[PDB]
């Protein structure tokens, strides 16, 4: 059998930059920051003072209150974003095509807020007052579960959990499902609602978070004075579709997914391998998968978390893979604006990568004020660039040494 | 534009289960109808309606690693690392700098480090966030089993963690199977791990009435029995080494069997309740049969999901009839959860191992504890006693919350 071509036919998102794709994207290409003071928890207890939160998100605008009450925020975001994506796709999921429409959405930690609140009930009211809905509300695969129920999607059904690589791995895995002919449509991406007491406690404890109290400068990928990531929340979901299936229904096509790379550092639980060698290998695997030369890559949407090690090592990995071309292509980290959505990062960044191609605009890295000699590539500082793009690469890396890369291409017949 | 299709064989097995702290012990107990269920000891069960569980017996992690290393791993990760090392040793696989990028790891867990989360959050509440460990986040996340296995083995290839509730172990193995099939790794260390015997897990599964409240360990787990009343929770890890065939042959590997089919569907029905008549499960079995390119009649033995809840065993029986027709009464079905309890995310891992060994050894493990026939569950559940038989194809089912259905098909290797 021949490999199927896989195109992107719908986009859905909730992010700190907007409660839909258009607003999120429009804010991104105008260098708008989604970072502000923490409100979701009490910032007094942590060295971190800022976060990238959804603004003005009222879940009841999208579903009944009683339905939302049986969903952790991570699931709420996923269901809202998935429905948005399917509506954008104008896909009618009938009984006839339901077994060929699947869902592959990941989350890095799933319903942590629900776990915390229920454990507190356990401690104060006793185990017999834990909710009958606790288990399904907490497990990370309930985003996929609830999405499939909301959509009537009966096909291949999964959830990848790979830390900060989650959103990228999930999309790549869905891509492979369609390539091998096991689904015609996959609703896929990542979702995360990690703004909780234990998440702030945990990422403070290992010094991962920026302790910069100024929301204007906290997230500054590649900057000499970067000091950690700024945590965000949301979901980025796309509809992937087999090409002939898309054409036959007159689907709109944003672009094509053509390459996916997955490697492991096998080095350390949290620290990236020296020189970003594992990330270099993942990019090389994605490039070989797409059947292109490295020079064909026009823009890299970096993982670019604003930690010391990540941005330095990702720069090294890019130089290793692209050689002289590393100084010719454009790189940017949109985490400068959205913050780090953890398991949802790969999802929103896939959306930005796809729209960069569709609209011919490279979103900038904001907040670079002090150049770092070790991070000397072209990070598209401050201002978006209008440019025709043919190929875009997006990286995600995670704890556990996960490296994941996707390559997107401008759709040509 | 060519779609690569490699053959994928099983070259190593490793396990910790309530039936033993290795594969040989677990397997020999299974074919002898031995129960791994007893009183709960891991937590104080006075405040839960459930009184029995399937725990590892005499598992001391310090027998496998230094205490200092164990203290940086949640039990779910301990089990995964120990089982994975056993699987790689069984495979006699030497991972070097040279083949490292072609060796990957795909181990799932349903919930990951829940005990760590409970203990660290109680510390947060009682002592404050400064007392939360720098190791809390990596210790808790489900993919740390894959991460720690990767680090221990030096495996640098395709790397992932599927989390699909009670389908987790089966999905993980199928996903690893597809990686090798499409040419993206030569070896995958894959399976499921779970350490769900915790205060919140017992509280949660009591609150939704999933657990059996039967206080008698002799009858608590009784899949397909008229008086079944919920599952008995267990723990452990089942890990296997999948390998591309020519690679396995080149290094002189021993081959237990071949993986040939994988089916994944969603009910799209309810967050916890299975779809009417197990229709989604039937579709997953049908997809796996199609993937394997065989007729339903070629299946000799089904290792059922068989959790001992009313609805699972009833609907799984219906699904089997739907898929196999008259052949449903000709093949053998059994649930080894009658002996192991329900290992949740690790269930598909240990059950994959039992399915593979059933083929290699030509022995079908029984369903124990069936005393009262249920008119609705009237298939051949291989009751009480193992059955010696030459098997060519075995199918293993898993189903989970979120409406996940996953099926694997294994084949005898020439
Ligand atoms: C509370 C956890 C939510 C999801 C967890 C993600 C793992 C942490 C990461 O991978 C982030 O450390 C950042 C990175 N390596 O990009
Ligand atoms: C609290 C621990 C969660 C880890 C595993 C969750 C799986 C939930 C399920 O799918 C189980 O209900 C059993 C089943 N459907 O077989
Ligand atoms: K920091
Ligand atoms: K990226
Ligand atoms: K029950
Ligand atoms: K099974």
Curated annotation (Swiss-Prot), chain A:
Gene3D superfamilies xref list: 3.40.47.10
EC number, UniProt record: 2.3.1.179
Annotated GO biological process: fatty acid biosynthetic process
A GO CC term assigned to this protein in UniProt: cytosol
Entry annotation: catalytic residues: 164 (for beta-ketoacyl synthase activity), 303 (for beta-ketoacyl synthase activity), 340 (for beta-ketoacyl synthase activity)
Disulphide bond pairs: none
Catalytic activity: a fatty acyl-[ACP] + malonyl-[ACP] + H(+) = a 3-oxoacyl-[ACP] + holo-[ACP] + CO2; (9Z)-hexadecenoyl-[ACP] + malonyl-[ACP] + H(+) = 3-oxo-(11Z)-octadecenoyl-[ACP] + holo-[ACP] + CO2
GO MF annotation terms: 3-oxoacyl-[acyl-carrier-protein] synthase activity
Family to which the UniProt record says this protein belongs: Belongs to the thiolase-like superfamily. Beta-ketoacyl-ACP synthases family.
Identification of the protein by name: 3-oxoacyl-[acyl-carrier-protein] synthase 2
């Amino acid at each position: 059998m021949t490999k199927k071509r896989v195109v992107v036919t719908g986009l859905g998102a909730l992010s700190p930059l907007g409660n839909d794709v258009d607003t999120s994207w429009n804010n991104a290409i105008n260098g708008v920051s989604g970072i502000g003071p923490i409100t979701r928890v009490d910032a007094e207890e942590y060295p971190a003072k800022v976060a990238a939160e959804l603004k003005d998100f009222n879940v009841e605008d999208y579903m009944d209150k009683k339905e939302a009450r049986k969903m952790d925020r991570f699931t709420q975001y996923a269901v809202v974003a998935a429905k948005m994506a399917v509506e954008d796709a104008d896909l009618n999921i009938t009984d006839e095509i339901a077994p060929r429409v699947g869902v592959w959405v990941g989350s890095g930690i799933g319903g942590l807020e629900t776990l915390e609140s229920q454990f507190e009930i356990f401690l104060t009211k006793g185990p017999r007052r834990v909710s009958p809905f606790f288990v399904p509300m907490m497990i990370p695969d309930m985003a996929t579960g609830q999405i499939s129920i909301a959509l009537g999607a009966k096909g291949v059904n999964s959830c990848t959990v790979t830390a900060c690589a989650t959103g990228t791995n999930s999309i790549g895995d869905a891509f492979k499902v369609i390539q091998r002919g096991d689904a015609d449509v996959m609703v896929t991406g990542g979702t995360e609602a990690p703004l909780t007491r234990m998440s702030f406690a945990g990422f403070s404890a290992n010094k991962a978070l920026s302790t910069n109290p100024d929301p204007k400068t906290a997230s500054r990928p590649f900057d000499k004075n970067r000091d950690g990531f700024v945590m965000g929340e949301g979901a980025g979901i796309i509809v992937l579709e087999e090409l002939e299936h898309a054409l036959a229904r007159g689907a709109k096509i944003y672009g094509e997914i053509v390459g996916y790379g997955s490697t492991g550092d096998a080095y350390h639980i949290t620290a990236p391998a020296q020189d970003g060698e594992g990330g270099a290998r993942a990019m090389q695997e994605a490039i070989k998968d797409a059947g292109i030369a490295p020079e064909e890559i026009d823009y890299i949407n970096a993982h670019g978390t604003s930690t010391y090690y990540n941005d330095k090592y990702e720069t090294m990995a890019i130089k290793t893979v692209f050689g002289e071309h590393a100084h010719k292509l454009a790189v940017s980290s949109t985490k400068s604006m959205t913050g780090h959505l953890l398991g949802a990062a790969g999802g929103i960044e896939a959306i930005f990568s796809i729209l960069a191609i569709k609209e011919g605009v490279i979103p900038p890295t904001i907040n670079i004020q002090t150049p770092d000699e070790e991070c000397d590539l072209d990070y598209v500082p401050d201002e978006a660039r209008r440019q025709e793009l043919n190929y875009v690469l997006s990286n995600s890396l995670g704890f556990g040494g996960h490296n994941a890369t996707l390559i997107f291409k401008k759709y040509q017949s």
